Amino acid sequence: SIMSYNGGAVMAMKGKNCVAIAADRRFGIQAQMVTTDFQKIFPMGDRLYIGLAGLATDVQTVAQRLKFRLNLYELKEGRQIKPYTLMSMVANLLYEKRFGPYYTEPVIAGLDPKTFKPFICSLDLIGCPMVTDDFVVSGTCAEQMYGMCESLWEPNMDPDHLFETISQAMLNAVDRDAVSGMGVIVHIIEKDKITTRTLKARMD
Amino acid sequence: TQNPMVTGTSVLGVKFEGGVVIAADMLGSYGSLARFRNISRIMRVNNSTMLGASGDYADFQYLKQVLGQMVIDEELLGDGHSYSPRAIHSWLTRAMYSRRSKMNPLWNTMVIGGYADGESFLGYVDMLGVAYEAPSLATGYGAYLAQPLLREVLEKQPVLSQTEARDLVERCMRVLYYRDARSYNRFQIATVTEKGVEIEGPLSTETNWDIAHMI
Amino acid sequence: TQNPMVTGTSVLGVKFEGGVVIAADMLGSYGSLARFRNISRIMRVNNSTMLGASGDYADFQYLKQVLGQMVIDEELLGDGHSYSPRAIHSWLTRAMYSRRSKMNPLWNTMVIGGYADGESFLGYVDMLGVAYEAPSLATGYGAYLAQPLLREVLEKQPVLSQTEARDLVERCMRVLYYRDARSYNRFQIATVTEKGVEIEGPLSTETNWDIAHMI
Amino acid sequence: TTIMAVQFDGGVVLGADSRTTTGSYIANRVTDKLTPIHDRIFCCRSGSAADTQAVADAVTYQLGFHSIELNEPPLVHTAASLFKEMCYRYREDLMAGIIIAGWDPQEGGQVYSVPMGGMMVRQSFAIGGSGSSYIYGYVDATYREGMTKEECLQFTANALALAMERDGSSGGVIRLAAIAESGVERQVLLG
Amino acid sequence: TTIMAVQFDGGVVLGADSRTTTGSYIANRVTDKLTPIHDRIFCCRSGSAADTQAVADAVTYQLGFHSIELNEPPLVHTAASLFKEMCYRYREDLMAGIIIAGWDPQEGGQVYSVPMGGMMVRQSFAIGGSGSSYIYGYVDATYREGMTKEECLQFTANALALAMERDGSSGGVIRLAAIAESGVERQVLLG
Amino acid sequence: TTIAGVVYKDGIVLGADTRATEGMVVADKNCSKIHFISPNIYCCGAGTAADTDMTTQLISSNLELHSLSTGRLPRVVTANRMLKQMLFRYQGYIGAALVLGGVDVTGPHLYSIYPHGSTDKLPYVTMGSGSLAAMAVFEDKFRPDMEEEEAKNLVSEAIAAGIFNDLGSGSNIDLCVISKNKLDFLRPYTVPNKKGTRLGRYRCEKGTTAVLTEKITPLE
Amino acid sequence: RFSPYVFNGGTILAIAGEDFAIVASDTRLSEGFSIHTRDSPKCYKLTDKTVIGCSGFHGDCLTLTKIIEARLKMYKHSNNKAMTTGAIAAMLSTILYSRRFFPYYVYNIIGGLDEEGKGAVYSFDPVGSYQRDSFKAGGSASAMLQPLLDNQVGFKNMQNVEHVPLSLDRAMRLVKDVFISAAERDVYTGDALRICIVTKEGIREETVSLRKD
Amino acid sequence: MEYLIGIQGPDYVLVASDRVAASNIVQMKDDHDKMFKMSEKILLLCVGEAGDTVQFAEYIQKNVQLYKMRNGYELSPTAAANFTRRNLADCLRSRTPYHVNLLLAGYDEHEGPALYYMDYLAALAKAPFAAHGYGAFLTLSILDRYYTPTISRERAVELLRKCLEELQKRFILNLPTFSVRIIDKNGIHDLDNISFPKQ
Amino acid sequence: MEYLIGIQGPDYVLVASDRVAASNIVQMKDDHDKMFKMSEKILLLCVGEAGDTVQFAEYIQKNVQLYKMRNGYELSPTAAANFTRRNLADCLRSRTPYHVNLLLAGYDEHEGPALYYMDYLAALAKAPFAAHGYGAFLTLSILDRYYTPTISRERAVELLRKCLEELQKRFILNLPTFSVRIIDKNGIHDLDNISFPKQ
Amino acid sequence: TTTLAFKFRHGVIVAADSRATAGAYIASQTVKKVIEINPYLLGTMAGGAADCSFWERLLARQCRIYELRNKERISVAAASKLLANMVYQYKGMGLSMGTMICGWDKRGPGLYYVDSEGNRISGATFSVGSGSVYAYGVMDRGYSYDLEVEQAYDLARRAIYQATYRDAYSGGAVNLYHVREDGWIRVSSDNVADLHEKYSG
């Protein structure tokens, strides 16, 4: 399919007072890779990120249009954006192309700007929002990511075991996929700091 | 129009000495179902020209509406001018040709009869904008069936009286009743003269079935 | 068979304590036309097993012919052996599977009910050779409509008496009359016991239309 | 779907089944197939459901606005003219089987037929719908000129019951309406 | 094409139009749509012309050979069984609308129906053909159990005349046949 | 997807389920399918999930605009007329199957809306993929002018018939009871499907995953 | 017009132990958006040391099972011994390839003991290529089960974790946990879980319920 | 079909293309140029359809020159690359899409050298080497074998010669000549043309 | 795609083919042979599908050798050519047609040299020169320009070299090497291989 | 899928990957794609799993009967020819087969290539698969006829590593066989993740 033209995998997972998000690194046309440093996770303010997967054209295009609407929002209002407000903003942007749709499926993760409350959601390619309490996934290798997260997720987890859970979920699911791989990057954010780690994955 | 829903059938027409006579039946078939078996398919335009049509009937009511307005619009001027039957044949040709060029045609086939200035007129109009004049016309299957009966008489005798012409149509309308699956035994005959336009009522035919007793 | 001409509709069946009850209607619809409104769609095989079918009816008369011969051919031996209802369910499966492999299938869907050796039996046969056993069966739209009414009772109560089961079918046959465009208000009920195979006559339903007075 | 309309000396008589189906499943078991437009003019609709509901609301808007200007009761032929304008213009887009009937002060009872093409014709009696082909030879052997009102209520009830017995898309319950100078007599029948 | 068959106490009554068409042109204006098989068994055929002529000659060959062996008059159910064997086997190849009727010494009058599928069923009365859908609701409101022969000749004549008036593929002339124990009374009617 | 509604002697009970699937994979175990319209009118959605969400917010925006300009309580026939006239303009491209219910001055009113723009007023409706299973319970067990708990028992039974048919839900049967004065809204009304417990040891170690490059960034 | 295939769902799991083999499957038989039955196990005891599972189109699963059981008897009266586990896997590949141009729509996994008393699992494809593995998951939920068993059984992508072989009791709770997680996200899975255990003492069966939606 | 190559160095960018302009069997022109000097430190390579290469790339060519004359200074190679991607993606969902494949070579005074990759679906990438065409398949694994990030410009021409001789061996098309540029802190320098005595 | 050439002389036949066995981009074999010695004075050249060349031409190869062993003498090149045409035309209206293109080169003791042409629709022709493939278009007008019926075998190799160098110039495929035979009153003699230093 | 084979002074080297996919889904990582026909013949699996598995097993059934009748091993050119004729009867019916035949012969080393289309050709170097064109570059740059034994082991092991890097349908382990005059011998089998640390340094 068109979603299977470049591959990709984005996973988010909710912790106790923190939230983690991960993605792969491979960029390539259908069977031939090109590079291993393709960005799929974009910062939208502090303690609030977004992940994109699907057609690599619409990954870079939507991330620039959303940044266009964000900076105009944060200047007419002195405050920063709330995580629910971004989800309503993205779903508006996708539904405007109702019949010419962008081929991407976003994943939003972040904390509350005032309190510590984590937030995860994901959307369809036309903008049906969906908030959960445990994890959201998107990409070509979706079913592999559901099988790992249903077994490894625990309700209240420190940032140590949250890191080890989403690492073991992403490493085992992506190695079963063919068109995803070549490295995995992990952002784990919290109230005090932001930790970015890259994992030792199979480069085949 | 891409799909004609309710259709008519063949329409005849032939000149004679001092007038034109036109006949058609009164049937509104829908596919094979003879659904509307009492309708009129001949329109009396003002005093000299006269129109019958085939093909789709809902499109015929549209042209019956538009031509009805144009005749009224000239009579209100009162300048002593009217549309000649050749002028209606010119206007109707440009209406059909412009309509197919938008690829949204009018599914009809129309016969225009008229008598003006001591001259008979008998004109054909196709769906695709093909138009000509002839001393005898026939649409539908009547171009295959009744048309050789018309041409044999006119080549053997170029002019016809009114009683010869009216008798000759009733023979051709009889033959169309035998061998057309969309025919009906109830038709009407319209005739222009110098006295005006006259439309006869729902006439009928007389059939023979003596060959049914044969094996 | 590539195009089923004259078709039936849904067939119900449910076990109970010491027997199996099966119902179907008496309609031979041709597309939307209810052309043959008095036919039987339930065949009484010898003394324990019993067959109803859906789908094409001309194919059903073929299997009614072939199964009718096989039962006669065993009774003439007189060795004290008969076909068990599970054996008919085995034979009919291989007949359907062999027929689709030639890409010339039999357009049916068949329900086999039987009671032998103190044991009820209720089997399904698909056109494509898909077969299974169940305590309740339904073909056609009845798999969408009457099947949730069957399963709710059997999960809340695993065994049923004969009067409970026969009353429960008449409720499900009533509901199929309301919301199936190929239904008919005349059906028959066949029942196996240890006493044999019994087929009731052309029963009817009782409808309610009090919601028609509402807006 | 089977619809029915017969005029008589006083006014007209209308009738229809219900059974709005979708494929082989009945979506609506009981349905008002006949619709008021003005106080004396009804229509019974056939074809696509969402199309004929949209057309009948537009004609009611136009005819209802038109009579308040004239301060006069509308003509039945005026109402049938408005359905012709929408159906002929928006052909290749709609599937409408409209039959317009109703009493008029100038002309009494009238029945008009607007089939899927877009033509318009006045008839003594008019039927339509999918199951109309089955009673189609019964109706002209049974019709007789100069009926009363109670005969026409008996006439259409036996006429609709044969198609409702037979056609799979038809059946349900019989809805009837009698329109005259006095009032509108609507009733729901089964038999 | 419209064919008709009604049984009564003595025997059966058959009837058909002629009008063999091809597209929208009538190829044959008058046509024997009903065909003798044995001295007491007729059939009236519908569907493809070249198919049903080929089937009826084969059944006449088989049934005519079969009765000379038994030295007995054949059964009507035996004749209807032979059409079922050819139509069910050679389905997807034929378009046949056969109705078999005739008097039998063992059983009197019988009417069987073999439609395009290949099934067989006995009926009190049976119709078929393209224009059969139009009189289809007239026939069961008019049918009455326990008719005489002269009523059934009147019954089928009015029944066929409505479709022949209406259906474009039907019409022409009415051919009737009455089969009883005595003889076969064939007549050609118009009205 | 299974939604249903009923009209009892005083008001309207609506019911729905809690599953959204993608292909044949359960995407959501808890999705709210009963949408707010006005303080007396609610709506259930079926079909394309994003088409029902964007439509049910637009009409809920206009009725808030209309009632605040009028100064009185909205009518259900106003919400019906807006929806059937919107969906007809898109020629059924917007795939939305809706069940509309509310209590007006005139009383309770229940509608069903098809994505081409055809509407029906009925005492009880079912929509969705599992609508055929839920209509079995209504057509067997409906009687006019039921009481409160008799109606809530019927809808919770009818939705549960669709859940044990396929494409049911990770069942959390939802109910919205609308009366002349009291409004109810119950998300976990009945939870019949419980996930079984996990019986395995899945010992994770702080350091059982190799890391190539770490990075720390403080905040404030 | 007539199409000769349809999909029925199902999920088959097999694990080769050190001296055992475990074959498990659900009992749901579905078609389209309907449930035919909630009691239809996919396990089949061929011999006392070999269990096969069959998924995919159900009409071919009934045919292919009856072909194999006939040819087991044809081996035995011709060779005076029962077939081994590896001999059945070699025979089945010829049977599946024999209809190469009108294939069986069946996924097959054979689990059982070898001649040395150790576990053996042979996976298949609808045309008849096979290989011996330690664990495979076939059917509709196959993509939801392979990445987890690579973590637990194969110990892939794990750092500083020793490789203890899978005991029998630890392998039981792994099978019971993967189907609970699979029944949440797959719609073609539920209503029961039939588990067969092949040891040197016979074949044990065990049934664990699942969610019924 | 035709070929591009993108060897990136520590302080230089080595690019090369072919010189063939064939028409369906015959080879009409054997000294064709596919190199477009956008600025004094930015090249542009374009491979695509018959008309879309000249129409699109000259639209970018004259539009970057407008930025220079109007502001007085030159675009960075990053912003110049990221302006081109905006023009395909806007013109993609239209009745007239452009079907070309690009790669960009630039030198910055602040960021050093740069290489970018472009698909006909307008995806950007920052690569240490790239290639296009059918010859991209055979050759880039050679270039993946012997690449060193700290490589000299003399080794890079030698590695380019290794990369082209295997395309002379196992590639069905002819491709005799190959034009070569180099970009450094001074500007675009033209290296000598690469041809092949085959046998 | 691949190439054949058929220069006929007064008492000799000069034939040459190419040596390429490519697979869809790559060139798997560069010393492939397309020349089949049917007899001691008859060659056979075969160009066609991937399997039909080896299957059909070896069927003719072993069947002419049967005529030699069984009768004791050799077929004429006319009858040997006209037997092959009988085998395509019989096997044409079948479920297994062969799609190959042939040309035959023979010398007779009574009739001298001979050259025949064969289509995949099995039509015979007696030609003074012929060619197959896409390179047949560019080259045979050169061969039509400088042909003389009374030509020497030294001019014919020179005319062959003119005929091949323009295929080196304006033809998109690679085609580096070309094997050459010659047939005279003595038998099949192998001339030297023709290769090309391009630049 | 990526296989390669080349012959040199000291016999024939055969190497292949071990990844088998199904669409975008990886079935396994431990597929033996080099089919051991005899103690003196080796065949590969490239394009179609059961097609290459069946017909080469049927070839191994055939060459054993030839050895029992004639008391002599079959030649490599003969075994390549028998496989070409069996496949050609099913031409157009949709077989996928692209294998190679390796083995020592009385004429020396032997290397033939066999398609499902009927391309029986000999040669010195071949590489078949989806990631085959990634192997032709790195192998032909390093190939010589006079390579050493340990040098040729490092060449083929490098060439599969560069193919599995760029291609998505190639991975797993890297198998390596060596055909000697007496018979074939298995050399080694290395994982790519172990070769990644060795080759990167």
Curated annotation (Swiss-Prot), chains B, C:
Gene for this chain: PSMB4
Recorded family membership: Belongs to the peptidase T1B family.
Keyword terms: Acetylation, Cytoplasm, Disease variant, Host-virus interaction, Nucleus, Phosphoprotein, Proteasome
Organism of derivation: Homo sapiens
GO cellular component: ciliary basal body; cytoplasm; cytosol; extracellular exosome; mitochondrion; nucleoplasm; nucleus; proteasome complex
Biological processes annotated in GO: negative regulation of inflammatory response to antigenic stimulus; proteasome-mediated ubiquitin-dependent protein catabolic process
Annotated protein name in UniProt: Proteasome subunit beta type-4
Keyword Nucleus: yes
Subunit structure, as described in the record: The 26S proteasome consists of a 20S proteasome core and two 19S regulatory subunits. The 20S proteasome core is a barrel-shaped complex made of 28 subunits that are arranged in four stacked rings. The two outer rings are each formed by seven alpha subunits, and the two inner rings are formed by seven beta subunits. The proteolytic activity is exerted by three beta-subunits PSMB5, PSMB6 and PSMB7. Forms a ternary complex with SMAD1 and OAZ1 before PSMB4 is incorporated into the 20S proteasome. Interacts with PRPF19.
Induction (UniProt): Up-regulated in fibrolamellar carcinomas.
UniProt subcellular location: Cytoplasm; Nucleus
Single annotated GO MF: lipopolysaccharide binding
Residues of the full protein shown: 46 to 260 of 264
UniProtKB/Swiss-Prot annotation, chains D, E:
Enzyme class label: hydrolase
UniProt catalytic activity: Cleavage of peptide bonds with very broad specificity
Reported induction: Down-regulated by IFNG/IFN-gamma (at protein level). Up-regulated in anaplastic thyroid cancer cell lines.
Role of this protein: Component of the 20S core proteasome complex involved in the proteolytic degradation of most intracellular proteins. This complex plays numerous essential roles within the cell by associating with different regulatory particles. Associated with two 19S regulatory particles, forms the 26S proteasome and thus participates in the ATP-dependent degradation of ubiquitinated proteins.
Entry keyword annotation includes Acetylation: yes
One GO-annotated biological process of the protein: proteasome-mediated ubiquitin-dependent protein catabolic process
UniProt organism field: Homo sapiens (Human)
GO molecular function, one term: threonine-type endopeptidase activity
Enzyme Commission numbers on file: 3.4.25.1
Active-site residues per Swiss-Prot or TrEMBL entry: T1 (nucleophile)
Name this protein carries in UniProt: Proteasome subunit beta type-6
Family statement drawn from the similarity comment of this UniProt entry: Belongs to the peptidase T1B family.
Chief subcellular location: cytoplasm
Keyword presence, Nucleus: yes
Alphabetic keyword roster: Acetylation, Cytoplasm, Host-virus interaction, Hydrolase, Nucleus, Phosphoprotein, Protease, Proteasome, Threonine protease, Zymogen
Annotated positions of the Phosphothreonine modification: T35
Cell location: Cytoplasm; Nucleus
GO cellular component: cytoplasm; cytosol; extracellular exosome; mitochondrion; nucleoplasm; nucleus; proteasome complex; proteasome core complex
Curated annotation (Swiss-Prot), chain G:
CDD domains with a match to the protein in the record: proteasome_beta_type_1 (cd03757)
Main location: cytoplasm
InterPro entries in UniProt: Ntn_hydrolases_N, Proteasome_bsu_CS, Proteasome_sua/b, Proteasome_suB-type
Keyword Isomerase among UniProt keywords: no
Family: Belongs to the peptidase T1B family.
Pfam families: Proteasome
Gene, per the UniProt record: PSMB1
Subunit note: The 26S proteasome consists of a 20S proteasome core and two 19S regulatory subunits. The 20S proteasome core is a barrel-shaped complex made of 28 subunits that are arranged in four stacked rings. The two outer rings are each formed by seven alpha subunits, and the two inner rings are formed by seven beta subunits. The proteolytic activity is exerted by three beta-subunits PSMB5, PSMB6 and PSMB7. Interacts with SERPINB2. Interacts with RFPL4A. (Microbial infection) Interacts with HIV-1 protein Tat.
Record-listed Phosphotyrosine modification sites: Y122
Protein name, per record: Proteasome subunit beta type-1
Cellular localization per UniProt: Cytoplasm; Nucleus
Matching SUPFAM superfamilies: N-terminal nucleophile aminohydrolases (Ntn hydrolases)
Membrane-traversing stretches: none
Result when mutating Y75H: In NEDMHAL; uncertain significance; results in impaired proteasome assembly
Organism: Homo sapiens (Human)
From Swiss-Prot, chain J:
Subcellular location: Cytoplasm; Nucleus
Record: residues binding bortezomib: A49
GO process annotations (BP): proteasome assembly; proteasome-mediated ubiquitin-dependent protein catabolic process; proteolysis; response to oxidative stress
Catalytic activity: Cleavage of peptide bonds with very broad specificity
Main location: cytoplasm
GO molecular function: endopeptidase activity; peptidase activity; threonine-type endopeptidase activity
GO cellular component entries: centrosome; cytoplasm; cytosol; extracellular exosome; nucleoplasm; nucleus; proteasome complex; proteasome core complex
Documented EC number(s): 3.4.25.1
Upregulating conditions: Down-regulated by IFNG/IFN-gamma (at protein level). Induced in breast cancer tissue. Up-regulated by sulforaphane in breast cancer cells.
UniProt entry tagged with the keyword Nucleus: yes
Active-site residues from the entry: T1
Source organism, top-level taxon: Eukaryota
Enzyme class at the top of the EC tree: hydrolase
Effect seen on changing A50V: Displays high resistance to the bortezomib, a proteasome inhibitor of the chymotrypsin-like activity
Keywords, sorted A to Z: Cytoplasm, Host-virus interaction, Hydrolase, Nucleus, Protease, Proteasome, Threonine protease, Zymogen
Purpose of the protein: Component of the 20S core proteasome complex involved in the proteolytic degradation of most intracellular proteins. This complex plays numerous essential roles within the cell by associating with different regulatory particles. Associated with two 19S regulatory particles, forms the 26S proteasome and thus participates in the ATP-dependent degradation of ubiquitinated proteins.
Homology family: Belongs to the peptidase T1B family.
Protein name: Proteasome subunit beta type-5
Organism: Homo sapiens
